[PDB]
Amino acid sequence: VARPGGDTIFGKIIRKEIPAKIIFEDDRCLAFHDISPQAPTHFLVIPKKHISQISVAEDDDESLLGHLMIVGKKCAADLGLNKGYRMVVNEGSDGGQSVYHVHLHVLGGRQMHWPPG
Amino acid sequence: GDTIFGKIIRKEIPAKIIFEDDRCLAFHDISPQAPTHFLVIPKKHISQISVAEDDDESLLGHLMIVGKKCAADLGLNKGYRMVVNEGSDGGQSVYHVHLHVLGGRQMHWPPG
Numbered sequence: 001v002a003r004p005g006g007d008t009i010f011g012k013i014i015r016k017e018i019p020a021k022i023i024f025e026d027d028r029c030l031a032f033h034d035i036s037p038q039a040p041t042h043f044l045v046i047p048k049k050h051i052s053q054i055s056v057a058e059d060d061d062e063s064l065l066g067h068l069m070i071v072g073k074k075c076a077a078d079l080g081l082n083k084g085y086r087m088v089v090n091e092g093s094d095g096g097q098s099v100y101h102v103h104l105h106v107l108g109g110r111q112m113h114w115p116p117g
Numbered sequence: 118g119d120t121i122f123g124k125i126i127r128k129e130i131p132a133k134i135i136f137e138d139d140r141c142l143a144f145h146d147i148s149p150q151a152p153t154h155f156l157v158i159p160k161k162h163i164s165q166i167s168v169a170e171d172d173d174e175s176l177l178g179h180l181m182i183v184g185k186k187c188a189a190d191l192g193l194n195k196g197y198r199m200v201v202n203e204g205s206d207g208g209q210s211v212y213h214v215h216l217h218v219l220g221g222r223q224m225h226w227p228p229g
C-alpha cells in the first residue's frame with residue numbers, strides 16, 4: 001500500500017515520482033509524450049490502474065480501454081493532428097513491448113506507412 | 118457512406134470470419150501483413166476514431182477484448198500488435214473503424 005499502481009516506470013510517472021511531459025490527466029488515465037518519439041508527434045495514453053499487458057485485461061476493463069482511445073483521439077485533435085494519426089498497442093515479445101504497463105501509442109505529424117512494422 | 122466492411126457485416130460478400138457477436142465482427146484481413154492479421158470492427162458504422170462519441174467508449178474497448186481473445190484462439194502466445202488508423206496520415210484504408218491485430222512474426226519499430 002506504500003505505492004499504489006506498482007513500480008514500472010509508468011506506475012512511477014502516474015505518482016509524479018519520475019517527470020513526464022503531461023498532455024491530459026483524469027481519474028482513469030494519463031496522456032504524456034513519448035521520450036523516444038517515432039513521429040513528429042508521439043504520445044502515450046495509459047490507465048492509472050496497473051494492467052501489465054492486454055493479453056491479461058479483464059472483461060470489465062472494456063470501458064477503460066475504450067477510454068484510452070477516446071482520450072487519445074481528443075488529445076490528437078488538441079495537438080493539431082488534422083491529417084490523422086496511428087494508434088498502436090504493443091503486446092508481448094512479438095509486439096515489441098518494453099514496459100509492462102498497458103499503453104496506447106498515438107503517432108502523427110507525418111505520413112505513416114504500411115505495414116505498421 | 119457504406120463501405121466494403123458494411124457489405125462484409127451484412128454477409129453480402131464473403132470474408133473468413135473468426136468471431137461474431139451482437140455488436141462486432143472479427144475476420145481475417147484480405148491483404149495480411151503478418152502470418153496472422155485480422156480485423157475487429159463494430160457493427161455500428163463509426164467512420165473513423167476521430168468522430169467516435171464518448172457513449173462508444175465501452176464498444177471500442179470491446180473491440181480490444183474481442184481482439185485479445187481471438188489472438189489467443191489463433192495461437193498468438195508470443196504477442197501481437199494492435200493498430201487503429203485515422204485519416205490520410207494514419208493510412209486508414211476503409212472509413213469504417215477497425216482494429217488490426219497482427220502477429221506470428223516479430224513486429225518492428227517504428228510501426229510504420
Ligand SMILES: Nc1nc2c(ncn2[C@H]2C[C@H](O)[C@@H](COP(=O)(O)O)O2)c(=O)[nH]1
Pocket residue numbers: 009020021032033034035036090095096097098099100103
Ligand atoms: N515519457 C516516457 N516515455 C517512456 C519512458 N520509458 C519508456 N518510454 C516509452 C518508450 C517506448 O515508445 C514505450 C515503451 O515501449 P513499448 O512497451 O514497446 O510501447 O514507452 C519514460 O521514462 N518516459
